[PDB]
Amino acid sequence: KKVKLIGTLDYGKYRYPKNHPLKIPRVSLLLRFKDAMNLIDEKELIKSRPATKEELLLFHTEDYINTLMEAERSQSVPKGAREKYNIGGYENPVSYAMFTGSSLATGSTVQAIEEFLKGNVAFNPAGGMHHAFKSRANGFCYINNPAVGIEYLRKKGFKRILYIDLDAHHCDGVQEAFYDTDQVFVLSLHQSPEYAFPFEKGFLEEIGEGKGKGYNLNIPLPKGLNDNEFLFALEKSLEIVKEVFEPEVYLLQLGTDPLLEDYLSKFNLSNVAFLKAFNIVREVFGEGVYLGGGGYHPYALARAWTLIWCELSGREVPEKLNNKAKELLKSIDFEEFDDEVDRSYMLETLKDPWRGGEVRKEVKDTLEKAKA
Amino acid sequence: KKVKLIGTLDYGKYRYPKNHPLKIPRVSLLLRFKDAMNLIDEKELIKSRPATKEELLLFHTEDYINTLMEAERSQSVPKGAREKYNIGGYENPVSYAMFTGSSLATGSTVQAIEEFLKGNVAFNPAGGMHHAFKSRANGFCYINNPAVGIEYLRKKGFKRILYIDLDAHHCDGVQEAFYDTDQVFVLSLHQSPEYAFPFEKGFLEEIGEGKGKGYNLNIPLPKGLNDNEFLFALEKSLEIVKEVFEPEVYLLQLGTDPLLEDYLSKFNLSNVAFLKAFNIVREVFGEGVYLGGGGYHPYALARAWTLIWCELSGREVPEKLNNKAKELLKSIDFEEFDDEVDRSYMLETLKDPWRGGEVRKEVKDTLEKAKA
Ligand SMILES: CC(/C=C/C(=O)NO)=C\[C@@H](C)C(=O)c1ccc(N(C)C)cc1
Numbered sequence: 050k051k052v053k054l055i056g057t058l059d060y061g062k063y064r065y066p067k068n069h070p071l072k073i074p075r076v077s078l079l080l081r082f083k084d085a086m087n088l089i090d091e092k093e094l095i096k097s098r099p100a101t102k103e104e105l106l107l108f109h110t111e112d113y114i115n116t117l118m119e120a121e122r123s124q125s126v127p128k129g130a131r132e133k134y135n136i137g138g139y140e141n142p143v144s145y146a147m148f149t150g151s152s153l154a155t156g157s158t159v160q161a162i163e164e165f166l167k168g169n170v171a172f173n174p175a176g177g178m179h180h181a182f183k184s185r186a187n188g189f190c191y192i193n194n195p196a197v198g199i200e201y202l203r204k205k206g207f208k209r210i211l212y213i214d215l216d217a218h219h220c221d222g223v224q225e226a227f228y229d230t231d232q233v234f235v236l237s238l239h240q241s242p243e244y245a246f247p248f249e250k251g252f253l254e255e256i257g258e259g260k261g262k263g264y265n266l267n268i269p270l271p272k273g274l275n276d277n278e279f280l281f282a283l284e285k286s287l288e289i290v291k292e293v294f295e296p297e298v299y300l301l302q303l304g305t306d307p308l309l310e311d312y313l314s315k316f317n318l319s320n321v322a323f324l325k326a327f328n329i330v331r332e333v334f335g336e337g338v339y340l341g342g343g344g345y346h347p348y349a350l351a352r353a354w355t356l357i358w359c360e361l362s363g364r365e366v367p368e369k370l371n372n373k374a375k376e377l378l379k380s381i382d383f384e385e386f387d388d389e390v391d392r393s394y395m396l397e398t399l400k401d402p403w404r405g406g407e408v409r410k411e412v413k414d415t416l417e418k419a420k421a
Numbered sequence: 422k423k424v425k426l427i428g429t430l431d432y433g434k435y436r437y438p439k440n441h442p443l444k445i446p447r448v449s450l451l452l453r454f455k456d457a458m459n460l461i462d463e464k465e466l467i468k469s470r471p472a473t474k475e476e477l478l479l480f481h482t483e484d485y486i487n488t489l490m491e492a493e494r495s496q497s498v499p500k501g502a503r504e505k506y507n508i509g510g511y512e513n514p515v516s517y518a519m520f521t522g523s524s525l526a527t528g529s530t531v532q533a534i535e536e537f538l539k540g541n542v543a544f545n546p547a548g549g550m551h552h553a554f555k556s557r558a559n560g561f562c563y564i565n566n567p568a569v570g571i572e573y574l575r576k577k578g579f580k581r582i583l584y585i586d587l588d589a590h591h592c593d594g595v596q597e598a599f600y601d602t603d604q605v606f607v608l609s610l611h612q613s614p615e616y617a618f619p620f621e622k623g624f625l626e627e628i629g630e631g632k633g634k635g636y637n638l639n640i641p642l643p644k645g646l647n648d649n650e651f652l653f654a655l656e657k658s659l660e661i662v663k664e665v666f667e668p669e670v671y672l673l674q675l676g677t678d679p680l681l682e683d684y685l686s687k688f689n690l691s692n693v694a695f696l697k698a699f700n701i702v703r704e705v706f707g708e709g710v711y712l713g714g715g716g717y718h719p720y721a722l723a724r725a726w727t728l729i730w731c732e733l734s735g736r737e738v739p740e741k742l743n744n745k746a747k748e749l750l751k752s753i754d755f756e757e758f759d760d761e762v763d764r765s766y767m768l769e770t771l772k773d774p775w776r777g778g779e780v781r782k783e784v785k786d787t788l789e790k791a792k793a
């Protein structure tokens with residue numbers, strides 16, 4: 050069961066516009082970072098390929114896909130496309146990520162799945178774009194690779210697919226995609242929609258409809274979440290899934306935005322808790338298909354996914370970043386959202402300190418209701 | 422030149438949905454607060470009236486207006502209206518504020534203007550909904566009363582109308598409405614679009630087009646803005662307007678969100694600086710039409726607008742809140758976004774301490790470029 054990483058430096062050419070949270074290097078950063086740390090060999094790396102039109106059509110509509118392609122080639126928003134397809138605004142702007150980048154990230158998810166079928170284990174850090182809908186862009190996402198991947202699997206004959214989303218935001222796009230089917234179970238932990246995007250969905254009451262009733266589970270969590278609360282929520286919810294769904298295969302979305310240093314979440318988690326969560330899922334369900342996800346702090350993202358890669362790769366996590374890695378991170382076009390924060394430790398060591406505390410009562414009550 | 426306040430308690434029945442920033446009482450709170458402080462007489466209060474369909478059509482389209490009305494009566498989102506009119510989402514949800522409340526706030530702006538014509542001075546705290554476009558809801562706004570009011574004025578024969586927006590967010594809706602005309606000058610101070618809503622407009626380069634070229638001025642400001650920086654920006658930009666535009670009449674939008682205690686802005690201003698800004702405008706352009714605006718902290722909003730009302734009303738600002746006022750604010754359905762903040766002083770005194778400091782170089786450079 051070989052361990053592979055799907056990616057390419059090319060993503061460095063498909064950044065989001067100047068002020069967009071996603072204009073920072075991410076997967077290409079991950080690759081250069083690991084290389085600087087000598088934590089990956091060319092043999093473990095699989096070059097990303099674009100998704101085929103056929104694969105995309107497994108979930109999205111022709112019209113939407115064609116609009117994305119036209120919008121990108123003309124680098125302009127086609128007539129009425131802005132309101133009909135939700136492209137062109139500050140959220141899902143025109144760029145070369147809208148189709149070329151997204152397609153490459155989606156094709157990479159299909160490759161990660163192909164490796165699973167071949168008996169290997171793969172990680173696609175560019176995937177996990179969980180917000181896009183069938184025919185509309187949403188939350189920075191143009192193409193929903195998890196939805197494409199899951200449909201890909203169903204067509205291959207799978208009837209019990211599990212999707213676990215650890216991203217700090219609710220996977221509204223994925224939830225909608227399989228809300229009415231019992232062949233797909235969606236489990237998501239995220240900041241409560243009461244105070245975080247998306248604000249319209251992600252509540253505990255949303256359990257699915259029709260045959261899918263009981264096959265969707267949302268675990269909304271409070272602000273200031275600590276490592277103990279996150280792992281508590283994860284463990285309890287996994288127990289709930291285990292007792293009602295026997296998955297033939299599962300996908301795990303690993304956005305790094307739930308980390309303390311990432312401003313797009315009110316969660317204050319550590320690297321180690323993030324890794325631990327990853328190992329907990331594997332202890333319960335074995336090996337699955339691993340995807341990336343939301344993450345807007347370059348240092349947090351690089352260190353966190355490096356931990357994930359070392360776990361899978363079976364290699365020891367070096368205590369500190371070597372000088373080559375420090376210069377890499379320092380050379381990035383970042384800038385902390387908050388002037389006085391002090392994140393210097395991130396350029397020193399890979400693993401951050403544990404960030405625990407007690408498990409709040411509301412968190413326990415939420416999991417309690419969930420079990421019902 | 423009598424001083425009037427346009428409003429009604431009825432707004433208390435048109436709150437936004439449960440988790441929306443605008444679900445808190447606002448204008449109705451203002452009214453009860455002033456009454457508890459004995460700072461207003463029934464004679465100074467003018468009951469708000471709905472806008473007529475004709476007044477609304479001065480700016481918005483029939484289709485959009487009809488959609489708002491239908492959406493509200495059926496309390497549902499009409500087919501395709503969500504994407505075509507941007508209603509129904511978490512930003513501009515279905516409620517009784519979408520049309521009844523909005524119409525009342527817009528009619529109130531027309532009344533404030535009618536009082537101006539009659540030689541009086543009026544303040545409409547419910548107005549200043551500066552985000553709505555001709556045919557689409559935006560930024561919590563369904564109807565753009567400033568745009569309706571300005572068009573109302575043009576039809577009355579005015580050819581030089583000035584609009585000053587002190588709300589912490591850019592008036593994209595108003596800017597678009599008069600971007601191509603020289604009969605209307607729009608001046609706006611706001612958080613730079615680089616980090617704040619709206620993110621697509623509000624940049625310094627947006628100076629207008631066609632005959633309106635040079636008749637739109639945006640003053641984008643940095644995070645952590647202090648009182649000295651705000652007044653510096655205000656004074657300098659006003660000088661710029663004075664030298665190129667001789668207004669026959671002007672409207673001033675007074676959203677309270679730029680205050681320290683309001684989480685929807687990275688500005689850290691004080692009550693007194695807010696009032697001072699108000700008096701500075703009046704010192705430069707005399708009496709105008711005063712409107713409300715964005716404001717999401719009930720205590721901040723009540724105290725700030727009370728200062729405004731006392732200024733206009735010619736009455737002394739009481740040092741502290743009496744017990745009746747304290748209980749009023751305390752009885753509100755609020756809850757601080759941040760657990761540990763300590764805003765107890767807000768329930769004690771009306772005026773907050775000055776929040777000054779030096780004027781950053783970038784702020785000076787921005788005004789510098791603006792003058793060009
Ligand atoms: C969509 C989203 C998170 C998605 C995610 O990570 N879900 O998985 C966060 C929004 C609310 C946000 O915070 C934001 C901030 C700045 C900005 N500009 C500076 C343009 C545009 C949007």
Ligand SMILES: CC(/C=C/C(=O)NO)=C\[C@@H](C)C(=O)c1ccc(N(C)C)cc1
Nearest residue numbers: 243244248440441511560588590618715
């Ligand atoms: C639109 C706006 C302010 C406009 C304003 O004040 N214009 O003058 C602010 C947005 C970005 C925002 O911060 C927000 C926060 C929470 C939320 N829900 C909890 C549903 C919905 C929106």
Ligand SMILES: [Zn+2]
Nearest residue numbers: 216218306343
């Ligand atoms: Zn996220």
Ligand SMILES: [Zn+2]
Nearest residue numbers: 588590678715
């Ligand atoms: Zn505002």
